[model samples]
Target: AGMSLTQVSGPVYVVEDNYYVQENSMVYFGAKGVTVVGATWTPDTARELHKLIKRVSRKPVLEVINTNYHTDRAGGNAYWKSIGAKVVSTRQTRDLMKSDWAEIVAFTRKGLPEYPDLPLVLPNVVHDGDFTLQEGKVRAFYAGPAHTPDGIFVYFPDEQVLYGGCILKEKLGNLSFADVKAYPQTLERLKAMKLPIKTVIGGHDSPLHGPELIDHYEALIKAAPQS
Candidate 1:
């Protein structure tokens, strides 16, 4: 009825749930503490993940990072905060979450019965551009915009893995809340980085793939219907 976490590489983990959509989340085991990226539609998903984390180690959850304002990405923020994890994201992602608050709340309720009356928990640690959440190991960066205007990327440089979130998909994915016009440019910026990416993780499917997955994402975005 909930979620499971897969250790993709060294300290990077992926969380997948069969709830609603196959939502993919992440956990970063840093030197200081654990940092979880993305959340579930229901807070229970986070709890399920909480149990899974303990299965590995008791190091506390230090932060929750959402790639965008999407329900599956930021919805469990408040739940994370209740347990002392500082919710983190780009400033624009936080702003967009509020701007689209009512619609997000109503939609979740209509689709899933008894969805939590989620509080719009903005990131206590707001970071723009490139920076390390754990110096060298867990690096967070914004590759322009793709899935959403504020969507960002988290790269594990030492591990050569990239958490593209919804920005990089498993298949020809949705552009419903995407920045269509800027999508190509976004991928271009990512490609330009030329990070010898070994593993790629998305928001709704398998969290393990090669650099070719980004190439696959590029083709998907290029093939998207322009409005």
Candidate 2:
């Protein structure tokens, strides 16, 4: 299936599912070129992302932000690095990548026959707490882990857009490989953040507006059977 691209707001564009794989990711073209959020699951997808960037802007893709350690999120790291784009993620994410690199690769190879068998390209920049770039134009916050132990959410304050990664899913979406015990609290914290959010772009599915996304996740978690 061909990827669908949509402008979330301002310079933020969301590319949904690669032509080959089913993974939704985002791209941001700021003063510093493009910042990719969530690398799709294959090198081919990364190649398409590079093409999309070139097609849209004259500036180079400076960095890629992986929202978690999952294959769909970080699998294209090596490809992005090959093009000189620095990879970034939270410290916890980096740690998970280190510990689970082998498993991740194995999992990816199941879906992608062309999955690279090279060393994992970890994030060059990592932070334990909230980190910002472009004078706070972009901000990534560690929301106490939900979908994964190292899950995080990125906020584009200038654009009033939030990238919830897999931590925040669409309405009626199921949480897979998640920490069900902590999931509810994580959603609560996100709800309490009270950011001036206008759009929420999730890891999968389309974008949602305001607190309605958080409210939906909260209700789903509450209705789910506790482990």
Candidate 3:
């Protein structure tokens, strides 16, 4: 009967000290450690999360994504697995998590006291190229690697909303150091996408506009050579 609650800025929720719960809505995060929310939600303790999701929208299936292998980003996989959510991640991330299941389980369990009650499984969908999930008018693009080894950005061409995930940072500039080889190329690829993305959402902080994204990308472009 241990239920904890913490209020965070914007819609993102940190499940616990080392876990986070990104809402159905998307928010943009810049290069700096934006303080939109702190890691405070525990995915294993799904009582509050269940209620929260139910209130957001009653879609039949909830697509859970692991932006990267970092505990704060991907630690919730176990909880999603238990609830039958289709977990999505890159092939690289899946393999990394698999290589050290015990370590991953232990890390997830440390923050989620209810780990034994939950199940841990790799992402159901492993992405390589580009994939689209269409629900009526919403078409989201799973695209990546700006923040961590397996980061994926989502884009909606119709609405022009780009879920930058951990890809592009707005304020502190872009952190391409996470994946030097893919950083610049990924930016170029994303920039070339046909989507006229007016609004950009990220994994951690506030939403940003197109020009702001351009600035973020330019910053990364300038720094990549030195990095």
Using TM-score, give the best candidate's number.
1
lDDT string, candidate 2, 1-227, tens digits: 46666787888898887444456788888886788888777666788778767878999888888899888888788799888988899888999999897887776677676766646778888887888766678888886767777888888988888887776666544455577778888878877888888887766665545657777776777777663
Instruction: Please provide, for model 3 over 105-165, each residue's C-alpha lDDT reduced to its tens digit, 9 standing for 90 to 100.
Output: 5755666655443233567878775455543223334445555556566554555666555
lDDT of 2 at 6: 72
- Candidate 1 local lDDT, 132-172, one digit each (tens): 77766777888787777888888888778888788887776
TM-score of each: 0.92, 0.89, 0.62
- The whole-model C-alpha lDDT of candidate 1 against the native structure comes to 0.79
Candidate 1 lDDT at 222 equals 81
The C-alpha stretches of model 3 lying farther than 4 A from their native spots are 1-41, 44-49, 100-120, 136-144, 171-177, 224-226
Backbone clashes in model 2, listed as residue pairs:
none
RMSD, candidate 1, Å: 1.9
For model 1, the run of ten residues with the poorest summed lDDT: 127-136
Q: lDDT of each prediction vs. the true structure?
A: 0.79, 0.77, 0.49
Worst 10 residues of 3 by lDDT: 31-40
Listing every candidate in turn, what is its Cα RMSD in Å to the true structure after a full C-alpha superposition?
1.9, 2.4, 8.3
Which scores higher on lDDT, 1 or 2? 1
- Measured by TM-score, how close is model 2 to the native structure? 0.89
- Stretch of 10 with least lDDT, candidate 2: 168-177
Model 3's lDDT to the true fold? 0.49
- Residue-level error in angstroms, candidate 1, position 140: 1.0
